[PDB]
Design a protein around this ligand. Structure first.
Ligand SMILES: C[C@@](CO)(OP(=O)(O)O)[C@H](O)COP(=O)(O)OP(=O)(O)OC[C@H]1O[C@@H](n2ccc(N)nc2=O)[C@H](O)[C@@H]1O
Ligand SMILES: C[C@@](CO)(OP(=O)(O)O)[C@H](O)COP(=O)(O)OP(=O)(O)OC[C@H]1O[C@@H](n2ccc(N)nc2=O)[C@H](O)[C@@H]1O
Ligand SMILES: C[C@@](CO)(OP(=O)(O)O)[C@H](O)COP(=O)(O)OP(=O)(O)OC[C@H]1O[C@@H](n2ccc(N)nc2=O)[C@H](O)[C@@H]1O
Lengths: 155, 155, 155
């Protein structure tokens, strides 16, 4: 079994809604990014790639490469997941922590778990997401952006 | 074995002392929270619940529910731990990292390990806490508040 | 198998270059620290010590003790690693995440993996490093300093 850690941040920008863990969540402002900027998933992806010892989402799916523009992060995830399985690993489980002041991630979480467990091809019981604010402190607390951490266990 | 990640933050406020990992630590300012605002423990709790795939402390013990007011976080911990054991898991080990500029967590750490290992019902050797500042950088570095991360392994 | 989490931050200061994961990386400003201030490694070290349940780099190699001045963090690492092996543990694998806006960690990463895998005495396949910025947000995003997280699995 191997461990892995991930982390991503994205600045709010423009109109909403935002995409987190696959769910289109309505919010005043949106998020700025080359891809769909789904922080929850990018975080999960790195943690997954990290366990696989394949580096990070950045070595694999460049900001520069235009094809990755508006890119559905779930695709990136599924691919990084493919390559991981090829390296002969299998999902132990993943845990994602969304550090955001807003919007309210809570109600969307189950749907996220559905999307993530699908992409990874596991049971929801192997995919856990949770959320938390930084109590008005920090860029996250100021509403400047969303951050997200994630850890994962591969076999 | 399953992994889990947690993270909490609390703004300083009012008179001290503060409570971290169960220890009443003297400090000029205190911490603002619905419960006792023990960051070290909330962080541990989420990480524990995350491994159990039970979500987070928020789905289980609401800011809104008044009973959780001034609430001894160790209780919340012990309960989240109970439910976890019921799901058939057992403590692999936990690691907590306190990111605070002040007060000096160091001298209180052993007592924390005592409290945490009790609550979890393991040996201190399965509970590790450590501390670090952000070098005057950030809300933590500015003394605006304390943050704390934690990871855990369940079986 | 045991888990472990680490985290460090260092303020930029003076002339470059900086040292991360062992690599001397050229950059305008440098980093302020009692030791060489290699964040990547300190982060790895704590995570390693955390899994071993030996506490943190701070309980073992003091800012105050002058010998640790300008100290090659790899030494600190190798020692913390020694003591860990003595406690009867062996490297499962480690994952390091550098949260820095600049300089570009990417090209130096392989050399880092070489240094880290040497120090730990494992194969590069057990040492993974990755990098990420906070999108101009935060002290890291403002270029005020570098932060770094790391997780580790011991056996
Ligand atoms: C998948 C993409 C493109 O579609 O998504 P978006 O960022 O557009 O949302 C990106 O490649 C996802 O980029 P991400 O890795 O999560 O955050 P970035 O700040 O863009 O990091 C880009 C790359 O630069 C490297 N890097 C990062 C920070 C730093 N100080 N030094 C570095 O060398 C890292 O190896 C990383 O892979
Ligand atoms: C145990 C309690 C109550 O006694 O402690 P205190 O916060 O008062 O200290 C709280 O429930 C402990 O709250 P905590 O989860 O650690 O931090 P909060 O910022 O209050 O998050 C509350 C809940 O809202 C959800 N949430 C959080 C942030 C966000 N952007 N969107 C969300 O949907 C999360 O699912 C979380 O469970
Ligand atoms: C290895 C050394 C010395 O050569 O490196 P440098 O910091 O000079 O680079 C230090 O001991 C590496 O210090 P580090 O632990 O990573 O960050 P620091 O902010 O200096 O934390 C110092 C110690 O104080 C304790 N501590 C920290 C923060 C806090 N709020 N309360 C505490 O009690 C921790 O137990 C930690 O071990």
């Amino acid at each position: 079994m191997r461990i892995g850690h991930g982390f991503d941040v994205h600045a709010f920008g423009g109109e909403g809604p935002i995409i987190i863990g696959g769910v289109r969540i309505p919010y005043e402002k949106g998020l700025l990014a080359h891809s769909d900027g789904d922080v929850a998933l990018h975080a999960l992806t790195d943690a997954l790639l990290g366990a696989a010892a394949l580096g990070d989402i950045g070595k694999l799916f460049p900001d520069t490469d235009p094809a990755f523009k508006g890119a559905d992060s779930r695709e990136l995830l599924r691919e990084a997941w493919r390559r991981i399985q090829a390296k002969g690993y299998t999902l132990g489980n993943v845990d994602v922590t969304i550090i955001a002041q807003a919007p309210k991630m809570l109600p969307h979480i189950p749907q996220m778990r559905v999307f993530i467990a699908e992409d990874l091809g596991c049971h929801m019981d192997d995919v856990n997401v949770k959320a938390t604010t930084t109590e008005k402190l920090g860029f996250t607390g100021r509403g400047e952006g969303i951050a997200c951490e994630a850890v994962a266990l591969l076999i």
